[PDB]
Amino acid sequence: QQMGIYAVMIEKMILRDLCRFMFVYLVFLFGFSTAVVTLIEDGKYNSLYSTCLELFKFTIGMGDLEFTENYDFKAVFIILLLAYVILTYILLLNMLIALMGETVNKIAQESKNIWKLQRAI
Amino acid sequence: SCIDTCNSVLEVIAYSSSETPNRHDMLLVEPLNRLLQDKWDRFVKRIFYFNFFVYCLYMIIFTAAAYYRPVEGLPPYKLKNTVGDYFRVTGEILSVSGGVYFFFRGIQYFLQRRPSLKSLFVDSYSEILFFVQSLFMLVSVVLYFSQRKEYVASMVFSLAMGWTNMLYYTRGFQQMGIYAVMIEKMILRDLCRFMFVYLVFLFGFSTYNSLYSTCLELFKFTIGMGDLEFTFIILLLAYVILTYILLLNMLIALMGETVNKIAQESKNIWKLQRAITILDTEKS
Ligand code: NA
């Protein structure tokens, strides 16, 4: 019963909150990565994949803020990175936690009923 | 009569002054919601989807043109007899055309609506954001033809604004449209309060012999990258305890509270946004 309901909650969270969050997060990440890589003149990080990975490192608490220096207008680079950090890390990821708490609050009976139907199947 | 079209009721509610007591709630009245849904499902869903597709194509072409910008120095850059250079230049022309299109669309909005300088910067955030993206694109063009490399700075701010503006089209889908209304309400209320207090604390504790370097080192703590030995211990521990362990968790808690109380208000605001979209499509 307990693990069953926990798995049902995981399913519900993956289908609603993770989905909505991943769409908005991927849009922001691609936009800010296309901006940063365009600003970069050349070097190791002059590819879309490398810059996307560098900006995704921020989501997992491993962002550098100085991962490259092959650019002009350091102010432009710093402002872009700070905007990306404030929009994703400090806002969107905490909002995901807050929306996950609301979902937990509202899907107890639904999650127990779904588990019971699964066991009936 | 005088509901669908006339001062029609729908055009009165949608284009209200943002001081109206129940601007978001008057659309819940029985006939109006069902009329707006009818207009949506009949013709405004298809028109809006076409607009979204066109905007996605525009952003893809702009991203491709900016990605393959030449690095030679002191524009303008002479076109070579290469197919790739012919694709890049046509993409750039399309990007500038879209920027001009959005600039003129913002001017037309500010003219026909005449915002009162408070609802200008308190409501209609989408119009201002698209207009500012267009402004960045036009400034980029002006700098580009002035032989200035700062054109790239204006262009990359236009690109990040244009990709972040794709969140406008989340309206037209209820779940994503309400999530985007909830993102707006978090940004205006919780992020603002937290950022004011957080910036005060950061500047105080920061005040590596330069202010910028120490501010960056102390901001690294917020993103889970703080060193604690980057170059004193009591100051760093006080800053960590007051920002990382207290204020950032308090932000999460307050965000949870907001989400709990804005559920109904977030749906009403999304419905009003879609009504505005349906009226704009009808008029144009
Ligand atoms: Na970390």
Author numbering:
A (entry chain D): 560 to 603, 627 to 703
B (entry chain A): 385 to 390, 393 to 593, 627 to 650, 659 to 711
Copy text from the publication.
The capsaicin- and heat-activated receptor, TRPV1, has served as a model for deciphering lipid modulation, which is relevant to understanding how pro-algesic agents enhance channel activity in the setting of inflammatory pain. Identification of a pocket within the TRPV1 transmembrane core has provided initial clues as to how phosphoinositide lipids bind to and regulate the channel. Here we show that this regulatory pocket in rat TRPV1 can accommodate diverse lipid species, including the inflammatory lipid lysophosphatidic acid, whose actions are determined by their specific modes of binding. We captured several states of TRPV1 ranging from channels in which the VBP is empty to those bearing different bioactive lipids, including distinct phosphoinositide species, brominated phosphoinositide analogs and a pro-algesic lipid, lysophosphatidic acid (LPA). Together, our data show how the VBP accommodates a range of bioactive lipids and how occupancy of the site corresponds to the structural status of the pore.
To resolve this question, we exploited our ability to generate TRPV1 protein with an empty vanilloid pocket, into which we introduced tetrabrominated analogs of PI or PIP2 (PI–Br4 and PIP2–Br4, respectively) as contrast-enhancing probes to distinguish these lipids from the other, unbrominated lipids in the nanodiscs. Previous work has established that brominated lipids are faithful analogs of the unsaturated lipids from which they are synthesized. In these high-resolution structures (2.2–2.4 Å resolution), we were able to identify the bromine atoms within the oleoyl tails of the lipids by visually comparing the resulting reconstructions against those previously determined for samples containing endogenous lipids. The well-resolved inositol headgroup of the bound lipids showed the expected differential location of phosphate moieties, most notably at the 4 and 5 positions for PIP2. Furthermore, conformations of both PI- and PIP2-reconstituted channels resemble the apo channel containing a native resident lipid. Together, these data demonstrate that the vanilloid site can accommodate PI or PIP2, where they act as negative regulatory factors to stabilize the closed state.
